[PDB]
Design an enzyme around this catalytic site. Structure first.
Site, PDB file in Angstrom:
ATOM      1  N   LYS A  59       2.902   3.699  -5.687  1.00 22.24           N
ATOM      2  CA  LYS A  59       2.370   2.654  -6.581  1.00 22.24           C
ATOM      3  C   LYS A  59       3.324   2.184  -7.709  1.00 22.24           C
ATOM      4  CE  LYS A  59       0.589   6.429 -10.025  1.00 22.24           C
ATOM      5  NZ  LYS A  59      -0.288   6.297 -11.119  1.00 22.24           N
ATOM      6  N   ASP A  79       0.866  -1.139  -0.117  1.00 22.07           N
ATOM      7  CA  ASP A  79       0.188  -0.236  -0.021  1.00 22.07           C
ATOM      8  C   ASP A  79       0.813   1.458  -0.011  1.00 22.07           C
ATOM      9  OD1 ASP A  79      -2.416   1.410  -0.075  1.00 22.07           O
ATOM     10  OD2 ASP A  79      -2.935   1.456   2.042  1.00 22.07           O
ATOM     11  N   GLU A 131     -16.820   5.264  -1.421  1.00 28.43           N
ATOM     12  CA  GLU A 131     -18.178   5.856  -1.431  1.00 28.43           C
ATOM     13  C   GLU A 131     -17.684   7.466  -1.402  1.00 28.43           C
ATOM     14  OE1 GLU A 131     -17.459   3.674   2.426  1.00 28.43           O
ATOM     15  OE2 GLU A 131     -16.309   3.959   0.866  1.00 28.43           O
ATOM     16  N   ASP A 143      -3.127  -3.059  -2.296  1.00 30.51           N
ATOM     17  CA  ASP A 143      -4.533  -2.165  -2.274  1.00 30.51           C
ATOM     18  C   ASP A 143      -4.439  -1.224  -3.293  1.00 30.51           C
ATOM     19  OD1 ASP A 143      -6.828  -0.990  -1.446  1.00 30.51           O
ATOM     20  OD2 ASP A 143      -6.389  -0.478   0.626  1.00 30.51           O
ATOM     21  N   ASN A 144      -5.384  -0.527  -3.648  1.00 28.48           N
ATOM     22  CA  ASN A 144      -5.447   0.555  -4.717  1.00 28.48           C
ATOM     23  C   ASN A 144      -4.897   0.205  -6.088  1.00 28.48           C
ATOM     24  OD1 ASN A 144      -4.192   2.050  -1.869  1.00 28.48           O
ATOM     25  ND2 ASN A 144      -6.345   2.489  -2.914  1.00 28.48           N
TER      26      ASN A 144
END
Ligand SMILES: Cc1ccc(-c2nc(C)c(-c3ccn[nH]3)s2)cc1
Length: 214
Positions: free
Chosen positions: A142, A139, A197, A167-168
């Site tokens: 990137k 995480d 969200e 993640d991501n």
């Protein structure tokens, strides 16, 4: 001062000490009140939880700590005696994460390592007495997912069954890491969709299970 420090203050000002759940909720509550995207959130949390429970790792390596939310999330689901190593490039973030873990009461289960993962990873065996990792949570930056995955293999830190959870992988995106773990027989991959969200966007995690030198 930094977002991570304001997060720490809010937790210390409001959460119940020694209660990991209280700490996670405080962090989530605050980050939503601030509409800061930089948080993992609780729907991604579920998928992390499910993975941590499924493979019950004895040694976990985390890349990227930030305010320590993910460290608290995982450490609270580590079985008695299991341990977490967390690498973090920013000294303040590392300091905050220590304090966040302290407040949660989970500091005994975690070792925070300061620096670039590329420098720290090759020291794990000699300097931190690691044999191999049971799980790796990716995480951090990137553009380091793929190089560190390669670096972990080269250093012999992975065994058959080691679980990489990234993640991501969609937002902001790690297409290079995905192409590599999905394209190589060294891994078995499962993709997890996860709605953000606040971005109003579909992100995802990728579980890649190492199969050994393949
Ligand atoms: C060449 C190079 C540059 C940077 C890194 C990074 N290692 C870690 C743990 C990073 C991070 C991101 C968020 N918290 N900590 S960034 C590794 C290799």
């Amino acid at each position: 001062d930094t977002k991570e420090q304001r997060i720490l203050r809010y937790v210390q000002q409001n959460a119940k000490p020694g209660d990991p759940q209280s700490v996670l909720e405080a962090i989530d509550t605050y980050c939503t009140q601030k509409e800061w995207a930089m948080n993992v959130g609780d729907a991604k949390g579920q998928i992390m939880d499910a993975v941590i429970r499924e493979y019950s790792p004895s040694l976990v390596l985390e890349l990227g700590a930030y305010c320590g939310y993910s460290a608290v999330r995982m450490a609270r689901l580590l079985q008695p005696g299991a341990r977490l190593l967390t690498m973090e490039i920013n000294p303040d973030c590392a300091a905050i994460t220590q304090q966040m873990l302290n407040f949660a009461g989970l500091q005994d289960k975690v070792t925070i390592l300061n620096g670039a993962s590329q420098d720290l990873i090759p020291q794990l065996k000699k300097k931190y007495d690691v044999d191999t990792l049971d799980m790796v949570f990716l995480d951090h930056w990137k553009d380091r997912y793929l190089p560190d995955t390669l670096l972990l293999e080269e250093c012999g830190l992975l065994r058959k069954g080691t679980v990489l959870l990234a993640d991501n992988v969609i937002v902001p995106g790690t297409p290079d890491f995905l192409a590599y773990v999905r394209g190589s027989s060294s891994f078995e991959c499962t993709h997890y969709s996860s709605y953000l969200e606040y971005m109003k966007v579909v992100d995802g995690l990728e579980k890649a299970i190492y199969q050994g030198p393949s």
